[PDB]
């Protein structure tokens, strides 16, 4: 879909009013299935490792998040369609320049390709960026063609601050999701009983990310 209109007339107002925005049928069936094949190839060839946390304490990571992940830049062989997804994500964000709150978005993370391998795995309630690490927008693409959340679970439940309802996001095939990464949107991945895939990038606010980098580089 043309990025300019999608960004300015839907994503921007959705995000400013609600902090959450769902765009269904983002890339179409053919591209979505190609991304699925690339993700399944990453899985099959042993690329995924246990998802990690910002700060590590005495606890096992698997008591917090049960997924296995790899990071993708988009130019690797066999990841070209994931790269197209990332470019489309970036195109929307660039068309939102200066319209998403007061943020100045200048960069992002690599893509995290994540799998909850059924078996009841999930992610306890958490905030993506609680202490100012620079992340302002979480962007997730789901690619689960036959997912029936009523049986397989895996719903992303977001608890947007100040709202009278929470937001249940089924991990639907070809669904794109945006939400503010900060404390306004605590969220949990409810237990998954089938293999569940999602691809996330986090967009950085320039000033906050610069401060977080200064903190890291000074110890």
């Amino acid at each position: 879909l043309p990025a300019l209109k999608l960004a300015l007339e839907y994503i921007v107002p959705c995000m400013n009013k609600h902090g959450i925005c769902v765009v269904d049928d983002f890339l179409g069936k053919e591209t979505g299935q190609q991304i699925g094949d690339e993700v399944r190839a990453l899985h099959d060839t042993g690329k995924f490792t246990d998802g990690q946390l910002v700060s590590q304490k005495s606890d096992s990571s698997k008591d917090i998040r049960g997924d296995k992940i790899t990071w993708i830049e988009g130019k690797e062989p066999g990841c070209e369609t994931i790269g197209l997804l990332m470019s489309s994500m970036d195109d929307l964000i660039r068309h939102c320049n200066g319209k998403l709150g007061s943020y100045k978005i200048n960069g992002r993370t690599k893509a995290m390709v994540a799998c909850y391998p059924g078996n009841g795995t999930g992610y306890v309630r958490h905030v993506d960026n609680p202490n100012g690490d620079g992340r302002c927008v979480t962007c997730i693409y789901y690619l689960n063609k036959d997912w029936d959340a009523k049986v397989s679970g895996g719903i992303l439940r977001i608890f947007p601050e100040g709202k009278a309802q929470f937001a249940d996001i089924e991990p639907k095939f070809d669904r794109l999701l945006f939400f503010w990464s900060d404390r306004r949107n605590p969220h949990e991945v409810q237990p998954a009983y089938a293999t569940r895939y999602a691809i996330t990038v986090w967009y950085f606010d320039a000033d906050e990310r610069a401060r977080a980098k200064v903190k890291y580089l000074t110890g």
Binding site: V54, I105, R125
Partner: peptide, 20 residues
């Protein structure tokens, strides 16, 4: 209260980030 960073999904702080 709990340190919410112990629950937040890791991202690399080193290297660069992707520049748009």
């Amino acid at each position: 209260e709990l340190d919410l960073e112990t629950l937040a999904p890791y991202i690399p702080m080193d290297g660069e980030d992707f520049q748009l």
